[PDB]
């Protein structure tokens, strides 16, 4: 209901970054606050009443403004500040409060190279009739990267899908995990199970594999 | 953890969503309970709120559809939520203003970890729990085929092992289930015990499987 500007930002660890928040009414009695939100967690109040920082919290961040317009600096962005911020307004005393939009910070590091795993499907899964492959790039950065399937050096489509974890709190880079996903029959059909990882972290194509049995 | 949230997980439309939030210790606050939730890749949308004089406020949409209220023998709040749609699958949190005030977000310094609820037609399933064992060194946890997506919950050696941990968000496999993994790195030295504990509430799924090379 509040105005959150901008809807994203990124900068490098180190850099002083600022977030605003706009409202329509005046805030009541100084109550404006900024939480800050991590993946899978709940939003955490890092500052109250425009500009007090709650315990524990780095002096990096501050706030300021009054009335309708409100500012949150972090003065040195970390990896462990990705997050969703949003402010958070009363206007009166009845039940005029409400949430900003929230504001996304994202952090720019050096291109650093992930760490490539493969896992074959687990016997407890083969006593069923299916068949799951999964391959793991670890700690890389930027987020960019291709998977691709080879069984048998034939490369497979639709069958796979992947899910990435948000940055890392301390080294700032994502971790990613692929799955392939083959019947049973399917898979005892075939012999070398590859993963091969295009990133920009890499001289080449990094490809990791197995034989089954 | 302090706030305590409890709920049912999935929720077939046209139900009543009956949510609790236990302050599980005791404090010396005379505290105020409020009410948000935040719908799957959205911002925060305040729902209610109860004062520390147990005076309850409701947001402009809730307050045709939404009951708040404390039981204090028990330090349970609850929100019930009647005539569920897709519309109300979101993660529904509680938080804790430190003022007693029952109509306020600039202040919520404590906050439950959120339950998830999801409001669909489709089926509860547990699922099945498979080991991604070692060929650093990295092992894991396949957490496949089930729905709905959350409340689910991984922890590693029944929570002493935290460093190093990724848990993927999950993704929605063409089967219409959920599939999940959670990986973490190791020194090649694995001689020592790693169980992996998933717990899936709407399913009543608690398996501790052990991932041996």
């Known amino acids: 209901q509040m105005t959150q500007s901008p809807s994203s930002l990124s900068a490098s660890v180190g850099d002083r970054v600022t977030i605003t928040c706009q409202s329509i009414?005046?805030?009541?009695?100084?109550?404006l606050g900024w939480y800050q939100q991590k993946c899978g967690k709940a939003p955490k109040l890092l500052i109250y009443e425009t500009s007090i920082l709650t315990s524990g919290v780095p002096s990096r961040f501050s706030g300021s403004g009054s009335g309708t317009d409100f500012t949150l600096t972090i003065s040195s962005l970390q990896c462990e500040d990705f997050a969703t911020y949003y402010c958070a307004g009363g206007f009166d005393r009845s039940g005029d409060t409400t949430f900003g939009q929230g504001t996304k910070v994202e952090i720019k590091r050096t291109v650093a190279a992930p760490s490539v795993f493969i896992f074959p499907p687990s016997d407890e899964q083969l006593k069923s009739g299916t068949a799951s492959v999964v391959c793991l790039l670890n700690n890389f950065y930027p987020r960019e990267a291709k998977v691709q399937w080879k069984v048998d050096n034939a490369l497979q489509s639709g069958n796979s899908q992947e899910s990435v974890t948000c940055q890392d709190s301390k080294d700032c880079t994502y971790s990613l995990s692929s799955t392939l996903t083959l019947s049973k029959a399917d898979y005892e059909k075939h012999k070398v199970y590859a993963c091969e990882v295009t990133h920009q972290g890499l001289s080449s194509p990094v490809t990791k594999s197995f034989n089954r049995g | 953890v302090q706030l305590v949230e409890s709920g049912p997980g999935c929720v077939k439309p046209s139900e009543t969503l009956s949510l609790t939030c236990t302050v599980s210790?005791?404090?010396?606050?005379?505290?105020?309970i409020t009410w948000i939730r935040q719908p799957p890749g959205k911002g925060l949308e305040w729902i209610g709120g109860?004062?520390?004089?147990?005076?309850?406020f409701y947001s402009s949409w809730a307050k045709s559809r939404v009951t708040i209220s404390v039981d204090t023998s028990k330090n349970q709040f609850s929100l019930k939520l009647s005539s569920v749609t897709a519309a109300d699958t979101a993660v529904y949190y509680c938080?804790?203003?430190?003022?007693?005030?029952?109509?306020?977000?600039?202040?919520?310094?404590?906050w439950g970890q959120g339950t998830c609820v999801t409001v669909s037609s489709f089926s509860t399933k547990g699922p099945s729990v498979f080991p991604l064992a070692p060929s650093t060194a990295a092992l894991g946890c396949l957490v496949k085929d089930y729905f709905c997506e959350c409340p689910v919950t991984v922890s590693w050696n029944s929570g002493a092992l935290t460093s190093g941990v990724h848990t993927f968000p999950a993704v929605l496999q063409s089967s219409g289930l959920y599939s999940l993994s959670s990986v973490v790195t190791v020194p090649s030295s694995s001689l020592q015990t790693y169980i992996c504990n998933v717990n899936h509430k709407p399913s009543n799924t608690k398996v501790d499987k052990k991932v041996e090379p």
């Open positions: 938080a804790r203003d430190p003022r007693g005030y029952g109509a306020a977000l600039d202040r919520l310094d404590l």
């Open positions: 009414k005046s805030v009541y009695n100084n109550r």
């Open positions: 109860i004062s520390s004089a147990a005076t309850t």
């Open positions: 210790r005791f404090s010396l606050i005379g505290y105020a």
